[PDB]
Design a protein around this ligand. Sequence first.
Ligand SMILES: [Yb+3]
Ligand SMILES: [Yb+3]
Ligand SMILES: [Yb+3]
Ligand SMILES: [Yb+3]
Lengths: 115, 112
Amino acid sequence: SGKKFFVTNHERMPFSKVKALCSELRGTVAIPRNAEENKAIQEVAKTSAFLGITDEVTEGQFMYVTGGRLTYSNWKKDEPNDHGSGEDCVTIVDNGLWNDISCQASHTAVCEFPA
Amino acid sequence: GKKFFVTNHERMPFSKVKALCSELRGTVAIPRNAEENKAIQEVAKTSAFLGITDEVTEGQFMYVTGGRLTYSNWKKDEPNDHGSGEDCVTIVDNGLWNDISCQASHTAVCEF
Ligand SMILES: [Yb+3]
Ligand SMILES: [Yb+3]
Ligand SMILES: [Yb+3]
Ligand SMILES: [Yb+3]
């Protein structure tokens, strides 16, 4: 990526636990700021992983957990869709594409640190 | 939860692994039982350094955090201090352990 490194224990848990874990490590839930970082996160995680982005405050408007409106994005076709009762978290899935999903779902924890 | 962590860094010498885990406020991974041994094996995939060395007294392996070993999984005839010297340990084939040079590049795995 060139600016940060990513860490994982390959454990799957709900978003609030991933956030607590990264805080314990003094890092942040992984956030792809560009295509290279996105591929880097996809590669280290291997399976679906949560990203540090949500639209909990303003529905339809995703923001970084660290603040600011989302710029770079790699949504799957027809996503984000706030499916069913709602989906406010984001996961990186096949091909590194993104899908908004329930924050209560369990996915791979990935934390980022400046390189 | 899963206590062993890996990064997207490439393989590196033991000094760099130690630097990495300390920068992360952790320790180089130490398996203290067969279950933990299998867990490090699975998160690393490729050979990885363990937090065990015989740097202080040749032939006497110790945890980097201190203490004599309570669990070991040495490959038959290991540790053999091959050639100049092998003071570091890697978990390799089928989870077995081999002492190797600390200057060799292997996967970094940290524990917290
Ligand atoms: Yb939403
Ligand atoms: Yb969705
Ligand atoms: Yb040795
Ligand atoms: Yb050896």
